[PDB]
Design a protein around this nucleic acid. Structure first.
Ligand SMILES: [Mg+2]
Ligand SMILES: [Mg+2]
Ligand SMILES: [Mg+2]
Ligand SMILES: [Mg+2]
Ligand SMILES: [Mg+2]
Ligand SMILES: [Mg+2]
Ligand SMILES: [Mg+2]
Ligand SMILES: [Mg+2]
Ligand SMILES: [Mg+2]
Ligand SMILES: [Mg+2]
Ligand SMILES: [Mg+2]
Ligand SMILES: [Mg+2]
Ligand SMILES: [Mg+2]
Ligand SMILES: [Mg+2]
Ligand SMILES: [Mg+2]
Ligand SMILES: [Mg+2]
Ligand SMILES: [Mg+2]
Ligand SMILES: [Mg+2]
Ligand SMILES: [Mg+2]
Ligand SMILES: [Mg+2]
Ligand SMILES: [Mg+2]
Ligand SMILES: [Mg+2]
Ligand SMILES: [Mg+2]
Ligand SMILES: [Mg+2]
Ligand SMILES: [Mg+2]
Ligand SMILES: [Mg+2]
Ligand SMILES: [Mg+2]
Ligand SMILES: [Mg+2]
Ligand SMILES: [Mg+2]
Ligand SMILES: [Mg+2]
Ligand SMILES: [Mg+2]
Ligand SMILES: [Mg+2]
Ligand SMILES: [Mg+2]
Ligand SMILES: [Mg+2]
Ligand SMILES: [Mg+2]
Ligand SMILES: [Mg+2]
Ligand SMILES: [Mg+2]
Ligand SMILES: [Mg+2]
Ligand SMILES: [Mg+2]
Ligand SMILES: [Mg+2]
Ligand SMILES: [Mg+2]
Ligand SMILES: [Mg+2]
Ligand SMILES: [Mg+2]
Ligand SMILES: [Mg+2]
Ligand SMILES: [Mg+2]
Ligand SMILES: [Mg+2]
Ligand SMILES: [Mg+2]
Ligand SMILES: [Mg+2]
Ligand SMILES: [Mg+2]
Ligand SMILES: [Mg+2]
Ligand SMILES: [Mg+2]
Ligand SMILES: [Mg+2]
Ligand SMILES: [Mg+2]
Ligand SMILES: [Mg+2]
Ligand SMILES: [Mg+2]
Ligand SMILES: [Mg+2]
Ligand SMILES: [Mg+2]
Ligand SMILES: [Mg+2]
Ligand SMILES: [Mg+2]
Ligand SMILES: [Mg+2]
Ligand SMILES: [Mg+2]
Ligand SMILES: [Mg+2]
Ligand SMILES: [Mg+2]
Ligand SMILES: [Mg+2]
Ligand SMILES: [Mg+2]
Ligand SMILES: [Mg+2]
Ligand SMILES: [Mg+2]
Ligand SMILES: [Mg+2]
Ligand SMILES: [Mg+2]
Ligand SMILES: [Mg+2]
Ligand SMILES: [Mg+2]
Ligand SMILES: [Mg+2]
Ligand SMILES: [Mg+2]
Ligand SMILES: [Mg+2]
Ligand SMILES: [Mg+2]
Ligand SMILES: [Mg+2]
Ligand SMILES: [Mg+2]
Ligand SMILES: [Mg+2]
Ligand SMILES: [Mg+2]
Ligand SMILES: [Mg+2]
Ligand SMILES: [Mg+2]
Ligand SMILES: [Mg+2]
Ligand SMILES: [Mg+2]
Ligand SMILES: [Mg+2]
Ligand SMILES: [Mg+2]
Ligand SMILES: [Mg+2]
Ligand SMILES: [Mg+2]
Ligand SMILES: [Mg+2]
Ligand SMILES: [Mg+2]
Ligand SMILES: [Mg+2]
Ligand SMILES: [Mg+2]
Ligand SMILES: [Mg+2]
Ligand SMILES: [Mg+2]
Ligand SMILES: [Mg+2]
Ligand SMILES: [Mg+2]
Ligand SMILES: [Mg+2]
Ligand SMILES: [Mg+2]
Ligand SMILES: [Mg+2]
Ligand SMILES: [Mg+2]
Ligand SMILES: [Mg+2]
Ligand SMILES: [Mg+2]
Ligand SMILES: [Mg+2]
Ligand SMILES: [Mg+2]
Ligand SMILES: [Mg+2]
Ligand SMILES: [Mg+2]
Ligand SMILES: [Mg+2]
Ligand SMILES: [Mg+2]
Ligand SMILES: [Mg+2]
Ligand SMILES: [Mg+2]
Ligand SMILES: [Mg+2]
Ligand SMILES: [Mg+2]
Ligand SMILES: [Mg+2]
Ligand SMILES: [Mg+2]
Ligand SMILES: [Mg+2]
Ligand SMILES: [Mg+2]
Ligand SMILES: [Mg+2]
Ligand SMILES: [Mg+2]
Ligand SMILES: [Mg+2]
Ligand SMILES: [Mg+2]
Ligand SMILES: [Mg+2]
Ligand SMILES: [Mg+2]
Ligand SMILES: [Mg+2]
Ligand SMILES: [Mg+2]
Ligand SMILES: [Mg+2]
Ligand SMILES: [Mg+2]
Ligand SMILES: [Mg+2]
Ligand SMILES: [Mg+2]
Ligand SMILES: [Mg+2]
Ligand SMILES: [Mg+2]
Ligand SMILES: [Mg+2]
Ligand SMILES: [Mg+2]
Ligand SMILES: [Mg+2]
Ligand SMILES: [Mg+2]
Ligand SMILES: [Mg+2]
Ligand SMILES: [Mg+2]
Ligand SMILES: [Mg+2]
Ligand SMILES: [Mg+2]
Ligand SMILES: [Mg+2]
Ligand SMILES: [Mg+2]
Ligand SMILES: [Mg+2]
Ligand SMILES: [Mg+2]
Ligand SMILES: [Mg+2]
Ligand SMILES: [Mg+2]
Ligand SMILES: [Mg+2]
Ligand SMILES: [Mg+2]
Ligand SMILES: [Mg+2]
Ligand SMILES: [Mg+2]
Ligand SMILES: [Mg+2]
Ligand SMILES: [Mg+2]
Ligand SMILES: [Mg+2]
Ligand SMILES: [Mg+2]
Ligand SMILES: [Mg+2]
Ligand SMILES: [Mg+2]
Ligand SMILES: [Mg+2]
Ligand SMILES: [Mg+2]
Ligand SMILES: [Mg+2]
Ligand SMILES: [Mg+2]
Ligand SMILES: [Mg+2]
Ligand SMILES: [Mg+2]
Ligand SMILES: [Mg+2]
Ligand SMILES: [Mg+2]
Ligand SMILES: [Mg+2]
Ligand SMILES: [Mg+2]
Ligand SMILES: [Mg+2]
Ligand SMILES: [Mg+2]
Ligand SMILES: [Mg+2]
Ligand SMILES: [Mg+2]
Ligand SMILES: [Mg+2]
Ligand SMILES: [Mg+2]
Ligand SMILES: [Mg+2]
Ligand SMILES: [Mg+2]
Ligand SMILES: [Mg+2]
Ligand SMILES: [Mg+2]
Ligand SMILES: [Mg+2]
Ligand SMILES: [Mg+2]
Ligand SMILES: [Mg+2]
Ligand SMILES: [Mg+2]
Ligand SMILES: [Mg+2]
Ligand SMILES: [Mg+2]
Ligand SMILES: [Mg+2]
Ligand SMILES: [Mg+2]
Ligand SMILES: [Mg+2]
Ligand SMILES: [Mg+2]
Ligand SMILES: [Mg+2]
Ligand SMILES: [Mg+2]
Ligand SMILES: [Mg+2]
Ligand SMILES: [Mg+2]
Ligand SMILES: [Mg+2]
Ligand SMILES: [Mg+2]
Ligand SMILES: [Mg+2]
Ligand SMILES: [Mg+2]
Ligand SMILES: [Mg+2]
Ligand SMILES: [Mg+2]
Ligand SMILES: [Mg+2]
Ligand SMILES: [Mg+2]
Ligand SMILES: [Mg+2]
Ligand SMILES: [Mg+2]
Ligand SMILES: [Mg+2]
Ligand SMILES: [Mg+2]
Ligand SMILES: [Mg+2]
Ligand SMILES: [Mg+2]
Ligand SMILES: [Mg+2]
Ligand SMILES: [Mg+2]
Ligand SMILES: [Mg+2]
Ligand SMILES: [Mg+2]
Ligand SMILES: [Mg+2]
Ligand SMILES: [Mg+2]
Ligand SMILES: [Mg+2]
Ligand SMILES: [Mg+2]
Ligand SMILES: [Mg+2]
Ligand SMILES: [Mg+2]
Ligand SMILES: [Mg+2]
Ligand SMILES: [Mg+2]
Ligand SMILES: [Mg+2]
Ligand SMILES: [Mg+2]
Ligand SMILES: [Mg+2]
Ligand SMILES: [Mg+2]
Ligand SMILES: [Mg+2]
Ligand SMILES: [Mg+2]
Ligand SMILES: [Mg+2]
Ligand SMILES: [Mg+2]
Ligand SMILES: [Mg+2]
Ligand SMILES: [Mg+2]
Ligand SMILES: [Mg+2]
Ligand SMILES: [Mg+2]
Ligand SMILES: [Mg+2]
Ligand SMILES: [Mg+2]
Ligand SMILES: [Mg+2]
Ligand SMILES: [Mg+2]
Ligand SMILES: [Mg+2]
Ligand SMILES: [Mg+2]
Ligand SMILES: [Mg+2]
Ligand SMILES: [Mg+2]
Ligand SMILES: [Mg+2]
Ligand SMILES: [Mg+2]
Ligand SMILES: [Mg+2]
Ligand SMILES: [Mg+2]
Ligand SMILES: [Mg+2]
Ligand SMILES: [Mg+2]
Ligand SMILES: [Mg+2]
Ligand SMILES: [Mg+2]
Ligand SMILES: [Mg+2]
Ligand SMILES: [Mg+2]
Ligand SMILES: [Mg+2]
Ligand SMILES: [Mg+2]
Ligand SMILES: [Mg+2]
Ligand SMILES: [Mg+2]
Ligand SMILES: [Mg+2]
Ligand SMILES: [Mg+2]
Ligand SMILES: [Mg+2]
Ligand SMILES: [Mg+2]
Ligand SMILES: [Mg+2]
Ligand SMILES: [Mg+2]
Ligand SMILES: [Mg+2]
Ligand SMILES: [Mg+2]
Ligand SMILES: [Mg+2]
Ligand SMILES: [Mg+2]
Ligand SMILES: [Mg+2]
Lengths: 16, 275, 48
RNA sequence: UGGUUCGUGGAGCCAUGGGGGAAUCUGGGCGGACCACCGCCUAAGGCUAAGUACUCCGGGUGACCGAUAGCGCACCAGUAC
RNA sequence: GAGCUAGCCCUGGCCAGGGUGAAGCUGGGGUGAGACCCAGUGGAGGCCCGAACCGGUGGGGGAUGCAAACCCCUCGGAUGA
RNA sequence: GAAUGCCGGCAUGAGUAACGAUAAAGAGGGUGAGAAUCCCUCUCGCCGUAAGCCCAAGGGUUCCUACGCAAUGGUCGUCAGCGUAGGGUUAGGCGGGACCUAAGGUGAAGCCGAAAGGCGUAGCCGAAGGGCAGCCGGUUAAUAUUCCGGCCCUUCCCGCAGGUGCGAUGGGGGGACGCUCUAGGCUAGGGGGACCGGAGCCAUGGACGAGCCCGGCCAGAAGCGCAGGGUGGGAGGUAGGCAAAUCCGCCUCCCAACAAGCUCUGCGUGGUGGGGAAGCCCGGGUGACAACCCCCCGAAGCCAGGGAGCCAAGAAAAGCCUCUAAGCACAACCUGCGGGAACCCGUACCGCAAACCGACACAGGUGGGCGGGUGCAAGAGCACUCAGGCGCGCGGGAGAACCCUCGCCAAGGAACUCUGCAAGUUGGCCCCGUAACUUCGGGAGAAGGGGUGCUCCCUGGGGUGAUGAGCCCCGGGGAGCCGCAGUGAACAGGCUCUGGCGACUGUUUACCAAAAACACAGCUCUCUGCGAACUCGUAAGAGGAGGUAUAGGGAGCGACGCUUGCCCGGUGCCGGAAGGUCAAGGGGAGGGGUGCAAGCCCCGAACCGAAGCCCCGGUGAACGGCGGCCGUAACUAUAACGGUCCUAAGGUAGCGAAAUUCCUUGUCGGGUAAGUUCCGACCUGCACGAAAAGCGUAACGACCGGAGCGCUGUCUCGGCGAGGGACCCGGUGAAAUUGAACUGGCCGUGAAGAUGCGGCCUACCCGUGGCAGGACGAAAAGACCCCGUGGAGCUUUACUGCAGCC
RNA sequence: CGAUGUCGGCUCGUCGCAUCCUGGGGCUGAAGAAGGUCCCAAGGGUUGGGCUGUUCGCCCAUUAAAGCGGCACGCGAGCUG
RNA sequence: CCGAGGGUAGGGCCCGUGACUGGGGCGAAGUCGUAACAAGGUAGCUGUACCGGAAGGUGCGGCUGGAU
RNA sequence: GCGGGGUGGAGCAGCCUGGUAGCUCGUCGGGCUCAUAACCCGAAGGUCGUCGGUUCAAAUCCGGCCCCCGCAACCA
């Protein structure tokens, strides 16, 4: 998931 | 003789406890105890200055008589031998013919019911206290003052003893528990005999909880930390030291001597310790 | 879950109160500033 | 070592943390290492108005603002929150 | 700023019920005396099962939420570090 | 006119999502302008170790009553924790203060620091700990251990009587203590009664009954009784308890001991004072002259400072008692009795929550006590239910897709998939029975089975009582009865075989990782002789430790078993009174400036001159490192063997395609119909290897592999059903997003992926429910990557400083 | 680069034809049967399983056959991870 | 009721076989060294321990079945 | 992609600094021994991987080619 921290777009919820 | 346990839990496999054979009295002398201010390794700033301390059993401090020249000539009776949680030795309760009650630490072989006494004219007998100059050469001895009237400092832990090697002016030569050869002033008091509870060193704590009971909090290796924390910190995966092994504060910790070089007592240490 | 504000009347007065402020140099500068600004209360109110 | 324009510079002067340590005018300091000569001044005690600075306060005046401006506040604002 | 969190200090409190059955002790056997064996008693333990309590393993839901970390099912510890 | 500009206003999305636990509602009657929503009644459902009750914190009038409905309330509202107003909180005994100390804080003395300030003995402060005197009922719309009633008690002042060497911030005793287990006797609480009191009831086939339903107590001073706790008496000596001491301590002597005596609690009784149900009738009245009795169960509470065991060895101070010193013995103190005196603050209400902490009347968080009954082996578990409290502040219909939660399924049974993920299965108790291996404990609930309800008959032991009856608790045997099914509902393990890692129970990235990571007992090295080393601090001062080498610090390794080889050339550390280098300082050959000169001033060689470095040694569980090429045996192949180069020394034992093996799905064997995984082997180990430990290892594991049995909707392959939504109607009514829009398909073109340009094709205008291919859809000025003479953490034999140490 | 979500699987298709099968053919070193090779043909069809994240590949049991490619290595506002 | 035996589950013994692996016996003329028999050129043997391509070596203690 | 190397039969010096190829083993002849090995006395064998260049002169210095080990191949 994008999500966690290797990628960064399209893919998980709010955090920022 | 340590007491073993059957392997009915993983920890009971190896746990050993003292036999408590010599103990004859299981509550302290109310007039000789005061509360021990547990510190947790914190100083008056509130800062941890000795790591990994705290959380042990509650304790009462038993006042010990480390200057037995306080009562020269007045014999006492050994009334009991009791457990002291503030030290490895056992302590002995003394009833002086004075009516005064004091605690000394209990030498090996001291039998309840015997008399002890202190002074220049005392019999060379287990439990008596004399200035070092009056004890025969060859006598093993404990609770040795290091300077006259300053209090017993040497050979106090369970089973330890110093042995008198010879005399040299106002000084006797002692072999300390560490094997160091030192000159101690002859006027210094000492108690003939070794400290009791020699079997102390053969106790196997057996589990982690037993270290917790003693106030010893878990010690964490420098290798387990990060560079902000310790010279040995970091590395990708495990990692050898990668430098001369070091304390958290930078200084080397394998062999680096740390006694102050210009210390005035060097004139009195004959030969540094053995082994 | 347990949130960060856990009101305690004794803790509030002993930490931020008038007499805690006056005890230290930084505490007095707080009162000095809040007076100069015209603050209606120099110090948190707490029932006691 | 600091001060001065002076950052070790030919580095004096003024001050002083450490060491050594006088003299009372035929004594002492200074004039940019030092020396001579020629001058200037009297250290290691103290006080001293005025001319100078500021604007919480009062007043006078604006080729200052005019309610998103002018103080954060023209109004119950260092308030509500 | 340690009213969150982390450690420590002082002082209090809490841990249903059920299971296993160490040492010791007693009796019996054994022996020169012993070690030891058997039974009973006993009730040890970072022992076992399981609420409270403390957790947060797997899955599903939730995802402008009931909630800026929650809900359900399941799961770990539960006299101890 | 643009700054993802700032402030404000108003749009779009849209009458859309949503209206906050799926515990649930229906009718009747009231009130009112208006009622699903307020009040009352009946029926229904939900909690009941709470979703009931009582404290504490926090909150701060939210409490009670009257009058109100603009806003607040996710709808409505006549209602309300909302608006307005009036009312309401009563103490010598409850809590805190006028008492005591704990950590800590502060701090006459004293110490230290440029200033600010930091320490610090006594002392003072500091409590949910110690100490201290109130129990039951009644009363208000709202307070009550507070008011009232009954019955008790405390301290202070004064007085009287009797007694006594009185007297203290001083001495002593006591207060005063852990964990686990636990005796006897009580009480709280509870079950039963064919006994006692009670308004009634007879239904629908039977019952007028030893029937049903309701209740059968609470408090109490002296005394007494039962049960416990605490406590020896006397004398002589005395140098210790920093003065004194008749006290306490120590020695001796006589008497007394599982007693008794004395003293102190608990429980019972106790003069007395209260309470008192169902049902009926309108909170009240009746019942009622209410009765208030017997049996059983029985605490974790009480007697209590009880008993036993264990090691990890379990606050202080005051009250209280005793001793004496000044003093004073007209006093003073003690004891009894009498009169008087007794202050300040809190008290409403919420309190697992709509009133506290979370912006909300928020499915979250919040410490202590009470927490009834029945059945299920027990229990605070589970189901139902009492007292009490609730139906969760939008509703009404409908009966689509699809989603959520749930039930079932023919045949098959892991064929699903990264993976049996998920869900089945198993499931409690009693009995039978249980393997390798093992550290002899374990493995173990191994595995696997059988039993389980009801009725009758016979009978063994316990508790209470009496030894008996009754009640209650553990059982034993025999004969039967019913169903598909007897832990008939609910709560309640699937199992086995075999590897890897870690010994184990523990700990961790609050909020993506619980692990093989950390810790851990244990092992080793090393430092430290005590004003220790080390750590914090400018210091004083602390910690270390009121410890003393069987101790304390640092480091690695990580139960246990068997072990841990070779290299000291480099780095580190240790030892080394020589030698080499070496700064300030000493020394002063010899120069220089200036002056008529005495002199003043400046430079200055040899030489003496620390630590450090050089140098000489030691040292591996210190940092670390542990070869290459060529040849050789009577088949071949391979080399025990040899030659030579190099090194400080050339990897030993053990292990090995491994959590390490690149080539690689190595090769062979096992398991499968089939095996890139797995297990067992082999060894040309790209690139294991011995405390960054090597090889094993019983037990343990929500760790990670592989296999099998059981069973299944995982699947072939889907079907049906339930409820909450989605849908329709009434009420309330968001959101991100948005240059404007009159916003089609193909093939091309275009900054290279076009609704918007070209050519063609297609297309009447506007919606609703649906699906997600496009609008290079939304979100977040890409985390990857580069660039910036941008930043920050970290390292070191990078540079340069500083602390610290020499 | 003020974001054009990145392998594979699943689901859902659709297109190309350089055709794997099925239909029609010519040549054959085509006796028959069965093959070989080339031509026409895209209507429809193109299995289940073991291993591996795999795409691919190998293997088992079958089959008329077990085709090859494109569609942002088709398809994450469709799922998985 | 018992009951051949069938079925489920878990044990014990024997036999055969197994990638690979351990040593053993034997085999006309292989390779390395020379341990033992002479004091076998270090007297030998020995129980144990450790080491080494190999026979062996060395330690500790023992035997004479040891020469002179 | 960068680095080192190629010389009597084997394993290595010489290459840096141009003129001179050396060390151990092996091989050949002769001793010693009954004989073999060990041992002792003599001797032989290399145009320096190859081609091209600089130079008076190349193993040596510089290029190309052949070959042999070694290191590297990272961010996606
Ligand atoms: Mg994001
Ligand atoms: Mg043991
Ligand atoms: Mg044992
Ligand atoms: Mg065990
Ligand atoms: Mg003892
Ligand atoms: Mg005391
Ligand atoms: Mg201390
Ligand atoms: Mg302090
Ligand atoms: Mg420390
Ligand atoms: Mg500590
Ligand atoms: Mg002791
Ligand atoms: Mg000690
Ligand atoms: Mg001395
Ligand atoms: Mg030890
Ligand atoms: Mg302790
Ligand atoms: Mg330790
Ligand atoms: Mg550790
Ligand atoms: Mg680390
Ligand atoms: Mg780390
Ligand atoms: Mg830090
Ligand atoms: Mg750093
Ligand atoms: Mg560091
Ligand atoms: Mg490191
Ligand atoms: Mg690391
Ligand atoms: Mg590594
Ligand atoms: Mg290491
Ligand atoms: Mg290293
Ligand atoms: Mg270091
Ligand atoms: Mg140091
Ligand atoms: Mg020493
Ligand atoms: Mg928290
Ligand atoms: Mg907040
Ligand atoms: Mg709190
Ligand atoms: Mg408070
Ligand atoms: Mg408080
Ligand atoms: Mg507080
Ligand atoms: Mg404070
Ligand atoms: Mg304060
Ligand atoms: Mg100040
Ligand atoms: Mg004001
Ligand atoms: Mg303030
Ligand atoms: Mg200056
Ligand atoms: Mg100057
Ligand atoms: Mg000076
Ligand atoms: Mg004069
Ligand atoms: Mg003059
Ligand atoms: Mg004059
Ligand atoms: Mg002069
Ligand atoms: Mg001057
Ligand atoms: Mg001048
Ligand atoms: Mg002048
Ligand atoms: Mg003067
Ligand atoms: Mg002057
Ligand atoms: Mg305005
Ligand atoms: Mg405005
Ligand atoms: Mg304006
Ligand atoms: Mg103003
Ligand atoms: Mg403004
Ligand atoms: Mg205002
Ligand atoms: Mg707190
Ligand atoms: Mg518990
Ligand atoms: Mg059991
Ligand atoms: Mg038993
Ligand atoms: Mg016993
Ligand atoms: Mg346990
Ligand atoms: Mg169990
Ligand atoms: Mg167990
Ligand atoms: Mg969870
Ligand atoms: Mg699950
Ligand atoms: Mg979230
Ligand atoms: Mg659950
Ligand atoms: Mg458990
Ligand atoms: Mg513009
Ligand atoms: Mg802007
Ligand atoms: Mg704006
Ligand atoms: Mg704005
Ligand atoms: Mg705005
Ligand atoms: Mg406006
Ligand atoms: Mg608006
Ligand atoms: Mg509009
Ligand atoms: Mg609208
Ligand atoms: Mg819409
Ligand atoms: Mg919504
Ligand atoms: Mg909702
Ligand atoms: Mg609601
Ligand atoms: Mg619920
Ligand atoms: Mg539900
Ligand atoms: Mg109805
Ligand atoms: Mg209704
Ligand atoms: Mg209504
Ligand atoms: Mg209405
Ligand atoms: Mg109502
Ligand atoms: Mg009705
Ligand atoms: Mg509030
Ligand atoms: Mg309203
Ligand atoms: Mg309204
Ligand atoms: Mg109004
Ligand atoms: Mg509203
Ligand atoms: Mg709401
Ligand atoms: Mg009305
Ligand atoms: Mg009263
Ligand atoms: Mg008063
Ligand atoms: Mg205070
Ligand atoms: Mg106080
Ligand atoms: Mg108190
Ligand atoms: Mg009180
Ligand atoms: Mg009372
Ligand atoms: Mg009234
Ligand atoms: Mg006590
Ligand atoms: Mg005590
Ligand atoms: Mg206490
Ligand atoms: Mg009672
Ligand atoms: Mg009962
Ligand atoms: Mg006396
Ligand atoms: Mg009446
Ligand atoms: Mg309790
Ligand atoms: Mg008690
Ligand atoms: Mg006592
Ligand atoms: Mg214990
Ligand atoms: Mg105290
Ligand atoms: Mg008188
Ligand atoms: Mg008296
Ligand atoms: Mg007063
Ligand atoms: Mg009240
Ligand atoms: Mg709750
Ligand atoms: Mg409420
Ligand atoms: Mg609500
Ligand atoms: Mg009841
Ligand atoms: Mg049960
Ligand atoms: Mg309870
Ligand atoms: Mg409801
Ligand atoms: Mg609720
Ligand atoms: Mg419909
Ligand atoms: Mg069902
Ligand atoms: Mg059915
Ligand atoms: Mg089925
Ligand atoms: Mg199956
Ligand atoms: Mg099956
Ligand atoms: Mg499978
Ligand atoms: Mg499928
Ligand atoms: Mg079950
Ligand atoms: Mg077994
Ligand atoms: Mg087996
Ligand atoms: Mg097994
Ligand atoms: Mg095993
Ligand atoms: Mg066993
Ligand atoms: Mg056993
Ligand atoms: Mg069993
Ligand atoms: Mg097993
Ligand atoms: Mg039966
Ligand atoms: Mg029945
Ligand atoms: Mg279970
Ligand atoms: Mg681990
Ligand atoms: Mg573990
Ligand atoms: Mg292990
Ligand atoms: Mg461990
Ligand atoms: Mg545990
Ligand atoms: Mg986390
Ligand atoms: Mg947080
Ligand atoms: Mg976080
Ligand atoms: Mg966080
Ligand atoms: Mg875990
Ligand atoms: Mg960790
Ligand atoms: Mg660890
Ligand atoms: Mg170990
Ligand atoms: Mg420091
Ligand atoms: Mg101390
Ligand atoms: Mg073992
Ligand atoms: Mg073993
Ligand atoms: Mg070895
Ligand atoms: Mg070395
Ligand atoms: Mg060396
Ligand atoms: Mg070295
Ligand atoms: Mg190094
Ligand atoms: Mg030197
Ligand atoms: Mg190393
Ligand atoms: Mg290295
Ligand atoms: Mg090295
Ligand atoms: Mg051959
Ligand atoms: Mg070796
Ligand atoms: Mg291998
Ligand atoms: Mg391996
Ligand atoms: Mg490897
Ligand atoms: Mg491989
Ligand atoms: Mg591979
Ligand atoms: Mg294969
Ligand atoms: Mg093979
Ligand atoms: Mg191989
Ligand atoms: Mg490693
Ligand atoms: Mg585990
Ligand atoms: Mg685990
Ligand atoms: Mg399987
Ligand atoms: Mg399905
Ligand atoms: Mg439905
Ligand atoms: Mg309609
Ligand atoms: Mg509407
Ligand atoms: Mg509304
Ligand atoms: Mg437009
Ligand atoms: Mg338009
Ligand atoms: Mg359109
Ligand atoms: Mg269109
Ligand atoms: Mg193009
Ligand atoms: Mg186009
Ligand atoms: Mg168009
Ligand atoms: Mg055009
Ligand atoms: Mg056009
Ligand atoms: Mg068209
Ligand atoms: Mg619609
Ligand atoms: Mg629609
Ligand atoms: Mg779409
Ligand atoms: Mg889509
Ligand atoms: Mg799209
Ligand atoms: Mg775009
Ligand atoms: Mg798109
Ligand atoms: Mg920006
Ligand atoms: Mg950017
Ligand atoms: Mg960004
Ligand atoms: Mg990141
Ligand atoms: Mg990336
Ligand atoms: Mg780039
Ligand atoms: Mg640069
Ligand atoms: Mg630049
Ligand atoms: Mg930069
Ligand atoms: Mg500095
Ligand atoms: Mg981009
Ligand atoms: Mg954007
Ligand atoms: Mg974007
Ligand atoms: Mg032919
Ligand atoms: Mg076709
Ligand atoms: Mg087609
Ligand atoms: Mg692909
Ligand atoms: Mg492949
Ligand atoms: Mg293959
Ligand atoms: Mg065919
Ligand atoms: Mg394709
Ligand atoms: Mg394409
Ligand atoms: Mg491609
Ligand atoms: Mg590609
Ligand atoms: Mg793709
Ligand atoms: Mg996705
Ligand atoms: Mg995908
Ligand atoms: Mg998308
Ligand atoms: Mg899209
Ligand atoms: Mg993932
Ligand atoms: Mg049969
Ligand atoms: Mg042969
Ligand atoms: Mg021989
Ligand atoms: Mg020989
Ligand atoms: Mg020999
Ligand atoms: Mg040897
Ligand atoms: Mg050579
Ligand atoms: Mg060379
Ligand atoms: Mg040359
Ligand atoms: Mg030669
Ligand atoms: Mg040439
Ligand atoms: Mg040439
Ligand atoms: Mg990257
Ligand atoms: Mg990188």
């Amino acid at each position: 998931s994008p999500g966690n921290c290797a990628s960064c777009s399209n893919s998980a919820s709010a955090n920022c | 003789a340590v007491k073993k346990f059957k392997p009915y839990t993983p920890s009971r496999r190896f746990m050993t406890v003292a036999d408590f054979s010599e103990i004859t009295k299981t509550e302290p002398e109310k007039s000789l105890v005061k509360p021990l201010k547990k510190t947790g390794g914190r100083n008056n700033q509130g800062r941890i200055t000795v790591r990994f301390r705290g959380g042990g059993h509650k304790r009462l401090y038993r006042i010990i008589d480390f200057k037995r020249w306080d009562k020269v000539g007045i014999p006492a009776k050994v009334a009991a031998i009791e457990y002291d949680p503030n030290r490895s030795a056992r302590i002995a309760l003394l009833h002086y013919v004075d009516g005064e009650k004091r605690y000394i630490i209990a030498p090996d072989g001291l039998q309840v019911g015997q008399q002890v006494v202190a002074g220049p004219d005392a019999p060379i007998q287990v439990g008596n206290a004399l200035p070092l100059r009056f004890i025969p050469v060859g006598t093993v001895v404990h609770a040795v003052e290091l300077e006259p009237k300053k209090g017993a400092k040497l050979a106090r832990a369970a089973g330890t003893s110093a042995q008198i090697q010879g005399r040299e002016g106002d000084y006797v030569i002692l072999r300390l528990p560490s094997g160091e050869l030192r000159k101690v002033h002859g006027e210094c008091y000492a108690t003939v005999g070794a400290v009791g509870n020699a079997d102390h060193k053969n106790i196997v704590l057996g589990k982690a909880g037993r270290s917790r009971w003693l106030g010893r909090r878990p010690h964490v290796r420098g290798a387990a930390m990060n560079p902000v924390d310790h010279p040995h910190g970091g590395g990708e995966g495990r990692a050898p030291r990668g430098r001369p092994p070091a304390s958290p504060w930078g200084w080397q910790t394998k062999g680096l001597k740390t006694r102050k070089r210009r210390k005035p007592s060097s004139r009195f240490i004959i030969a540094r310790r053995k082994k | 879950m347990k949130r960060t504000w856990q009101p305690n009347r004794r803790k509030r007065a002993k930490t931020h109160g008038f007499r805690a402020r006056m005890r230290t140099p930084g505490g007095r500068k707080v009162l000095k500033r809040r007076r100069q600004k015209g603050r209606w209360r120099l110090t948190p109110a707490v029932r006691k």
